[PDB]
Amino acid sequence: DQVITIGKHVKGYHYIIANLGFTDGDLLKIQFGGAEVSGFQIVDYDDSL
Amino acid sequence: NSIQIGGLFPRGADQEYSAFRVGMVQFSTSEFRLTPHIDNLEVANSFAVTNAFCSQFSRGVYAIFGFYDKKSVNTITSFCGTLHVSFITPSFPTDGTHPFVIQMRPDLKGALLSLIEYYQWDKFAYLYDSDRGLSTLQAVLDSAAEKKWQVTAINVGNINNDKKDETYRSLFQDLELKKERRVILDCERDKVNDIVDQVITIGKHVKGYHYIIANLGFTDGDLLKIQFGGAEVSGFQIVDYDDSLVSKFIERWSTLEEKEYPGAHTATIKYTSALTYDAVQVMTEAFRNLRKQRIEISRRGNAGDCLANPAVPWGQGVEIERALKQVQVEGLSGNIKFDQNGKRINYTINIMELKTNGPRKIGYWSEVDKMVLTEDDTSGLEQKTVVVTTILESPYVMMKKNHEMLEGNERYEGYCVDLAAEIAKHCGFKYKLTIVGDGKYGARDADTKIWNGMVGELVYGKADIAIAPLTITLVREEVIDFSKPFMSL
Amino acid sequence: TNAFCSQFSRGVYAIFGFYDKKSVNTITSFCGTLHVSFITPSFPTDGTHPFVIQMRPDLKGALLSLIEYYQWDKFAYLYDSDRGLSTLQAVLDSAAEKKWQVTAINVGNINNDKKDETYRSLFQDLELKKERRVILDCERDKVNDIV
Ligand SMILES: O=c1[nH]c2cc(C(F)(F)F)c(N3CCOCC3)cc2n(CP(=O)(O)O)c1=O
């Protein structure tokens, strides 16, 4: 949220959410900005269990 | 002495109805009375406007205070035009000369054209709103020919409430492919809050993208979203809170209830609501000035058949209308002074910006004098123009042949001048040439120890650099720190 | 409004009639509420007003297809604001995409003493920018006055 209000999610600013469960947050805020945000998950939903 | 007035408030107007219900009593002297018959309705539907115009014609009011929209401005001004029933409103500043209809909203259409010339634009995009009319679109296109603009007017007022997210993004992605880093947003309040959110999510509020919220009441929105981005967002207000009547009013306003006046506790008033307070001031100052000249405006059991064939007046006509169009009150908008038509003369639309601190004011637009820049001129913030002290000795800096034609830092030319222009690019600064008085490159005096010439001005205080032929010697290296040499003579 | 209720005081079943842009909102609201079908050879309304039967079909698309056949980007779209701005709103939205440079002048509200001054101020203020591709957009009475 404080990246967005000061406008640091435009094209260029790469991020790495180093937290094990990357999609557990509110990613539909910087998804459409233009900043490549990588991440880490363990519970990959495209699987059997 | 208890004059019956109508008043057609919309179905979704709460704060607007508040400042009517507020301004009714805290303005009224108990002599007169302003008995309403307020009818709420969906004003985009000329059917219900027609019923409620004749319902308040059946009861025989002397003025109606309604809000029209695009799809009903041709209904209100037509019925009021023929049946002579006076009408006062803060809605659209009507295209043309409709009689008996008092516009209290100021005419924005001139203030937008003045502002752009101050920023000197040519390359807008003019996202506008279809439902709020197009009279401003035919003032920045009709006047785009003369001043060579390249308006890229995109209608955004037809956007569905499910395809909102997709279309506004595809809107600016289209404007990005044309590289339009200037938008002159034109909508009403709730579409400005929906655009500013969709500007942020796609990250178009960084440094560069100027905006102009062309809406009369710039601070009525949610500006603490793009305040800290970096995008200069100008604007327009009429209720300037740094004044007498507003500050008195806002103290009363901020103390009000949550359920007696809905949406009143907030310390900012909507301009639609704000003019409504200034309306009630006009809506009796005429009528009490009317009682100063003894005009009995009274009537009878007026037939509730507006659609009478033939259609006669209500009697007396212009007698009300003369009173309304002479009222010079002072309200919380400025000098409310009308004309023979119903448009406001001599108001004070004041141009704002949006700095990091908050919504700063930078002066005003007002019919007589176009754009007054009454701003803090103490915001200089300069990069002080250093006194480059220089001797005059060719093939270095020499005086050009047109030596009495131009002035300042273009007069001199030579080796030092092209050196100064080249050193200024790297050491980034600004500079203004200065020839020393006596000559005398450098000399410490015999006993008084007063330096001479360019050393005398570099040492003491009246210089910042000495781009000139000074020989690096020992007795000038102590007091002045040289640069590594640019020429080995 | 007078005549519509005079027709409603006879209980008519189809109303033929014309409407300007100053009466479009009165009719399509009345015929939408009081469900009386209204047949009209006037400019079609923007939007989706029910119970009006419009028969001047649509110019809005044909004007956009004719320009593409001539391949323009240098118009001078002189419009008359007495028939709906709905066509101007089309060749400004479609002026974004196809890279056009419309210079839309209101040639509408102009009285008769300035008819030999405003137009002779008008075309010179197109010739000074060298516009050669005017898209005159008026009803017949105003077209012959420009021509
Ligand atoms: O720092 C110094 N730089 C100087 C630079 C020059 C020039 F060549 F013009 F650049 C001259 N000139 C030599 C020829 O006659 C005209 C003046 C004198 C300079 N002097 C006085 P100096 O003691 O005689 O050297 C300085 O002190």
Author numbering:
A (entry chain D): 206 to 254
B (entry chain B): 10 to 498
C (entry chain A): 59 to 205
What did the paper state?
Synaptic complexes of α-amino-3-hydroxy-5-methyl-4-isoxazolepropionic acid (AMPA) receptors (AMPARs) with auxiliary subunits mediate most excitatory neurotransmission and can be targeted to treat neuropsychiatric and neurological disorders, including epilepsy. Here we present cryogenic-electron microscopy structures of rat GluA2 AMPAR complexes with inhibitory mouse γ5 and potentiating human cornichon-2 (CNIH2) auxiliary subunits. The core of each complex is a Y-shaped tetrameric AMPAR with a three-layer domain organization. Auxiliary subunits are membrane proteins that associate with and regulate AMPAR trafficking, cellular localization, gating kinetics and pharmacology.
Recently, we noticed that HEK293S GnTI− cells transduced with GluA2–γ5 and grown in the absence of antagonists displayed more intense fluorescence of the C-terminally concatenated green fluorescent protein (GFP). We purified protein from these cells, supplemented it with 0.1 mM ZK and subjected to cryo-EM. Data analysis revealed two distinct populations of particles. The second population produced a three-dimensional (3D) reconstruction with densities for four auxiliary subunits around the GluA2 channel. The map quality was sufficient to unambiguously identify and build models of four GluA2, two γ5 and two endogenous human CNIH2 subunits. Despite each GluA2 subunit in GluA2–γ5–CNIH2 being covalently linked to γ5, density was observed for only two γ5 subunits, suggesting that similar to GluA2–γ5, the other two γ5s were disordered. The transmembrane helices TM1 and TM2 of CNIH2 form a binding interface with M1 of GluA2 subunit B or D and M4 of GluA2 subunit A or C. Positions of CNIH2 in GluA2–γ5–CNIH2 complex are similar to their positions in the competitive antagonist-bound GluA1/2–γ8–CNIH2 complex. Comparison of the closed-state ZK-bound structures in the presence and absence of CNIH2 revealed a strong cylindrical density in the selectivity filter of the GluA2–γ5–CNIH2 pore, which was not present in GluA2–γ5. We subjected the protein that was used in cryo-EM experiments to mass spectrometry (MS) analysis and identified the presence of polyamine SPD. In agreement with this finding, the density in the selectivity filter of the GluA2–γ5–CNIH2 pore showed a near-perfect fit of the SPD molecule, independent of data processed in C1 or C2 symmetry.
